[PDB]
Task: structure prediction
Amino acid sequence: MHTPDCVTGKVEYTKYNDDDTFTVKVGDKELFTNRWNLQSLLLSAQITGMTVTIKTNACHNGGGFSEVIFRGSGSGSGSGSLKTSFKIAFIQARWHADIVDEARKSFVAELAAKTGGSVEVEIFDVPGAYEIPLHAKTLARTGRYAAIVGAAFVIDGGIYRHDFVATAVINGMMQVQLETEVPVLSVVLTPHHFHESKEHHDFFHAHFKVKGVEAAHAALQIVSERSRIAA
Amino acid sequence: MHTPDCVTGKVEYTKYNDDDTFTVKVGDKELFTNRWNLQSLLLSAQITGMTVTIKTNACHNGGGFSEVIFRGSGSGSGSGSLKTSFKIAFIQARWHADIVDEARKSFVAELAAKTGGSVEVEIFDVPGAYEIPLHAKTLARTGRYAAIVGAAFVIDGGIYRHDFVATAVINGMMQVQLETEVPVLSVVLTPHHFHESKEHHDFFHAHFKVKGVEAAHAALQIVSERSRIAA
Amino acid sequence: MHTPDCVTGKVEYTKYNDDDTFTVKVGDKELFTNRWNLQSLLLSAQITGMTVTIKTNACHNGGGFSEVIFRGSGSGSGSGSLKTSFKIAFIQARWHADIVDEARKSFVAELAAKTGGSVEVEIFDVPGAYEIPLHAKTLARTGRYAAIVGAAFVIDGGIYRHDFVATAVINGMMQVQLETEVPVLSVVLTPHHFHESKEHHDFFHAHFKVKGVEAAHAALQIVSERSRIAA
Amino acid sequence: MHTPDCVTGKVEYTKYNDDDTFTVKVGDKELFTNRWNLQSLLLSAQITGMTVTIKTNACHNGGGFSEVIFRGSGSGSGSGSLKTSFKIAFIQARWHADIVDEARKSFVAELAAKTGGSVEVEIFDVPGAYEIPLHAKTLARTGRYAAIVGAAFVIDGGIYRHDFVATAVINGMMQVQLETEVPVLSVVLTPHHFHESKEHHDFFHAHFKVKGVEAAHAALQIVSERSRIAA
Amino acid sequence: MHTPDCVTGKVEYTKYNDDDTFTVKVGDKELFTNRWNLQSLLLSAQITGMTVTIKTNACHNGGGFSEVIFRGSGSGSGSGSLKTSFKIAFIQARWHADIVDEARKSFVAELAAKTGGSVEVEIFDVPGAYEIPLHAKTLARTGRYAAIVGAAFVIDGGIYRHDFVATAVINGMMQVQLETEVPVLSVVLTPHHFHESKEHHDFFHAHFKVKGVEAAHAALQIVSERSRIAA
Result:
């Protein structure tokens, strides 16, 4: 009931001691309980990934407790302060890096101008576009990010067919988005023609800035809309 | 058994007290029970998302009870009154908004004319068509909606290939439809040619009204058919 | 052990009474038991969707029992008598209804001629082809049907691209078929050219009869083959 | 422990008797135990599909036991003797049967010549290529087969588009392969042109023999490789 | 608590003895415990695939124990020493083997030159590209590999359409990647034109070396990046 909180977070593990006591590690402190039903409750919570809150006056490793709060506290991964202070993960392929960097710089500059520094952008590098969905899924499952942006330049090199990889990447990004319930913005673009001539390079080098600005606006709007409909 | 109902709804959490009593939060009131088997029953119901109905004369927080109704009551999310009074969620992209707004207005006007105000339409904005499947999935899991409509105008801009995004959006909408068992109507249209000329603008501006009317009729018919086959 | 059966079917709900007794609703009658281990057994069976059979002399609501048959009895949904007497669900879109009706009539007539009335066909209407996979999934999960047939006419109208919807519908029908282990026959056809001229109308109006006869033969053959390999 | 084995196999069902004893059906014999913890153990094993081995001197229905081996024994479905003596399931569509039969005969003859009769081939008929993935999935879950081969001839008839069905069939075969962990060989072929002329018929009639020989070699190689990497 | 470790690993099976004792096989030694709650704990850990560590002075089969470590130890499959010493699995199809061998040799030579022998490459053979996703899924689930590379040469033979198989293979590789959380590099290439002439053979024979070097660099970079973001 009424007792100051000591630890709050997902159960790392549930241990059984020699004295028929249930030792459960919550947060940075290990605590043990002597209630037999609490053993099954903590085991089920750990199995189902349900967080518990243990409040006791002995906030130390190995301390005893008898009152457990099973109310929602995050159930594991989770982060975020206020509503306009969050983080965004930017994943960029390293093929045609001089063009993707334009979009990245435009995105970062526009976010800084709009939010005034309340939104933080983290940059991650991958070899190619095929590596983006798995990296996005790995980053999304840790919480810590309100949105994820993937940037790549997939072109037809004139030797091998390129549509298979682009289709797979787009489908995988959509699948990760639906799986993790975390928005994923797509800046993976496939031009109709790119013959690596001087004229082609300048055009897309200039256009990726506009693409980055559009992506920044879209990310801000979608995060705000999700926050609003989340009541 | 025979006892006036106090609370009815999904179990928010199941708490263990110091006196070996099981505190379960159902509805807006917290109640506790002293039956050891009821502890396991409530834990399993919460784990499997099975709703319970607790009836007692002490309809207040912390009250005691011994009789629990495990009959179906919604199992969490759920809404809807009668059969012709429901709600529809309309999701519209903001690219080429002047054309999509025609379909939205036609849809709303036709629904108002047909149902006479019994059906309510709620409008949600997303940056682009790529953001529609996740928004639809998020809205579907809350109940509260008998159908979901997604409207977008995906065109070929003459610079980048556009079929990947359209394919991903259609496939994702179908996947969400199959996952959540909630109908999703598609007003995501891809014209053969759109060169942003004056002639092209007027034609589709006019055609989206017909598209919206067709979507309204389809939504009404599909909701009625699902209600009928649900016995 | 040896006791005449009273109720056989899936457990609707498991109720705990004030006298530490487990009340379980099987079939149309509610019964209660006083075995503590039977409480956990029935709870697990309801959680895992495992049917139980309760045989007792008190075949009435609220009666007591002690012997439970946990042998396979259907595990919920299930229907079917003999091997040549089953039911088929026919789902038809309402776009170009005058052509789809030809296939439906041919299918019904051929089934009546072949089986002699042992096979029953039920007709369900949907607005368009996009609504077919969800309706098929909903109908398949109730048992009651040995096969499902979906009929639609998806054409290129000359304004919007149509391949996305056709691909989504075919993939969704395949996914539902693999998910529910119920055969789904496809009569969703996309012609190379259809310009709504008089010549085009008559040709497909005539061809859909042959398509329906072929679908009827295929459905009969596949149902017989599945029955045979099911040992 | 040390006791001669009586029955070994998956638990068909777990029954509770009137004398607080747990009756479990393993293999062709029904046996009961009086250990309360064994009741929960057997219930969990049946729920999770974990096989148990019951050894007792009373190898008869209704006999008692107290020692249970929970070591891996198959967990349900499973078959196979030695490493070069297995079975293969051949699924053939009945469209253009005169061409598919060439591949089937070539496959069977090559397998007989190579293995000398150690490998057995079973033939299953389906109406069309659309029926292959579900049949393959149904056959795979029974064990009893080290590989599955699907043969069909999908052509463009000049009236309706055919790529949707071929794409769905190939994707479904891959999905079943990944789901059931059973190799599925593809002999579903789509020619560039087939106008049902005399010249076209002979060419593919001759080529399907080579296709069948290639499929036989591939099946043998893949089964051997999986056996090798399975340690 | 404080006791030297004896066995650490996933629970192979949980056995119940005649003396109401729970025998659990961890690692290469079998041990039994007399704690009733430990029986349920070990059963749940085996069901959920949660590893346990048993530390006792009787490090032998059939020994007794009372203290169990439930802390994370691998939960089953898992391998890897340091951060620059890992293993890579190379899967190569046997169609056009003389071209794929160039990529394999280039990959191995570049890895040996870069890592100096700290990274080990294992080569697995499959009949065709269609067999790659299942082999990759089987190899990934055993741990033991930080990345998987699939190499194949899918060409248009001029008789049958080839895009279905390539699309299925790429999609399946992406699906396995997302399922198993193990990176999968794609060296499955489809040229625009390959007419088996002398000129075509030499060009791709030379280009596959560059492809292999690129794949080696990409694999090293992605493994390092995943290790870095794993904190």
